[PDB]
Curated annotation (Swiss-Prot):
This is Inositol-pentakisphosphate 2-kinase. It is an enzyme of class 2 (transferase). The gene is IPK1. The gene coding for this protein might be inactivated to commercially produce plants with phytate-free grain. Indeed, while the role of phytate (InsP6) accumulation in seeds is unknown, it causes nutritional and environmental problems, partly due to the inability of monogastric animals to digest it. Pfam families: Ins_P5_2-kin.
Length: 390
């Protein structure tokens, strides 16, 4: 089953992260109706020598022919054993022509954030792509959430100066630095600690915060069509205008105050799904925080630790720690998609069926332990610094 230059006409922009573009099928084929295609971007072979060393315990993973089988097996072999297979769909292998990739790249350039184009195009060196269900299909209202990390570190390896790292969420400390680099306009109201808190009340607080300031953490589609949140990027606060048209968009679906109810019914969904519980235990596979795990990284890549207990560990442990760090990084950066067509909305007294799905599940590259460390370092220095302003 191979896609050619012709079929580039049957797929249309759904959005992108840093690593991937996502098209939704607008054609007529019964093999792609209700599918998306996830295409890897190339910034400006499957696994490095170091990574092969680190994923050694993984027969199939290490042997994948391309990246797409690589993603396919990562999700299926390493992630599904953890999150569980009602909410994760690893999604199928699909061959594509290099000419199919090119025209797609050209075709949707116009629909992308410019800074996203400055950074990467699609990788036209690929012969392949992954096809996943379109979770915005089930009148389907579909909500995407990018919860980020919903706990605080407690690590012995977090030094005296950085101990704020143990009091203040990474999300909130990062909001300040994103501002500094004009990547967001205002600070986000959302707080993942409320979402992963597990309190029914606080989970709603977070859904509210997400509506006000969605940034790249909140999206809502109807019929697979964006009606709140940025496209391939973050987005500024929800103004009364923005809200007005949203309320109007909820016309019909909800019977009502249509916005107040949407939130309530998204919140009831999330909390009664309990799906944030598992994810949180996976995020917690970061047992030592980057400031601990970074030392394990250097032994693993056979390199004198520039940062210098941890180094006297058996290699089997050092490897585990790194593996676990990166599976964690996968859970910290993934998204939940909730579909609506159970939740019973009190006022109107309606009833909604729902499905929840994890998406944006991606293998983190091992070499990224270094950027992780540098980003983290920069985060806490800028926070500590803007805290001296007192
Ligand atoms: O480009 P952004 O919208 O700012 O998002 C990126 C995220 O992108 P995705 O939504 O595409 O997953 C990065 O992942 P990559 O696609 O670049 O690989 C991720 O990087 P890591 O998962 O490796 O951490 C990073 O997360 P973070 O900032 O927590 O390191 C996160 O940025 P934000 O979530 O902060 O916006
Ligand atoms: N299976 C899916 N169904 C519906 N929409 C999706 C699906 N996968 C991704 N999307 C949309 O496309 C966007 C980008 O996809 P994603 O896989 O998160 O890219 P990246 O890995 O680079 O972050 C997401 O924000 C999401 O809104
Ligand atoms: Mg990704
Ligand atoms: Zn060290």
């Amino acid at each position: 089953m191979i896609l050619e230059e012709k079929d580039a006409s049957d797929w249309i922009y759904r959005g992108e992260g840093g690593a991937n573009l996502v098209l939704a099928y607008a054609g007529s084929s019964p093999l792609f109706v209700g599918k998306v295609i996830r295409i890897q971007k190339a910034r400006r072979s499957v696994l490095t020598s170091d990574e092969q060393h680190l994923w050694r315990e993984n027969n199939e993973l290490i042997s994948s022919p391309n990246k797409c089988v690589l993603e396919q097996r990562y999700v299926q072999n390493v992630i599904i054993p953890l999150l569980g297979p009602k909410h994760v769909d690893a999604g199928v292998r699909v061959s594509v022509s290099k000419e199919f990739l090119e025209c797609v790249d050209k075709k949707v350039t116009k629909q992308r954030p410019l800074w996203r184009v400055n950074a990467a195009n699609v990788d036209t060196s690929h012969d392949c792509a992954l096809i996943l269900n379109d979770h915005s299909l089930f009148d389907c209202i579909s909500v995407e959430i990018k919860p980020k990390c919903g706990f605080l570190p407690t690590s012995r390896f977090i030094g005296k100066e950085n101990i704020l790292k143990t009091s203040v969420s990474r999300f909130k400390m990062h909001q300040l630095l994103k501002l500094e680099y004009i990547e967001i306009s205002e600070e986000s109201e959302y707080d993942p600690l409320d979402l992963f808190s597990g309190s029914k009340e606080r989970v709603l607080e977070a859904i509210k915060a997400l509506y006000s300031t969605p940034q790249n953490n909140f999206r809502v589609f109807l019929n697979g069509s964006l009606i709140l949140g940025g496209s391939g990027e973050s987005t500024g606060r929800t103004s009364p205008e923005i809200g007005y048209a949203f309320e109007d968009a909820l016309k019909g679906f909800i019977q009502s105050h249509r916005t107040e109810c949407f939130l309530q019914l998204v919140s009831d969904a999330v909390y009664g799904s309990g799906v944030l519980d598992r994810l949180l235990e996976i995020q917690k596979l970061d047992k030592l925080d980057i400031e601990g795990a970074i030392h394990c990284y250097y032994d693993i890549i056979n390199q004198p630790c520039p940062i210098c207990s941890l180094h006297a560990l058996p290699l089997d442990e050092s490897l585990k720690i790194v593996k676990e760090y990166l599976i964690a990084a996968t859970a910290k950066d993934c998204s939940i998609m909730i579909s609506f067509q159970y939740v019973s909305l009190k006022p109107t007294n309606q009833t909604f069926d729902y499905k929840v799905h994890f998406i944006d599940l991606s293998l983190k590259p091992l070499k990224r332990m270094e950027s992780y460390y540098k980003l983290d370092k920069k985060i806490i220095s800028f926070y500590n610094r803007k805290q001296k302003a007192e």
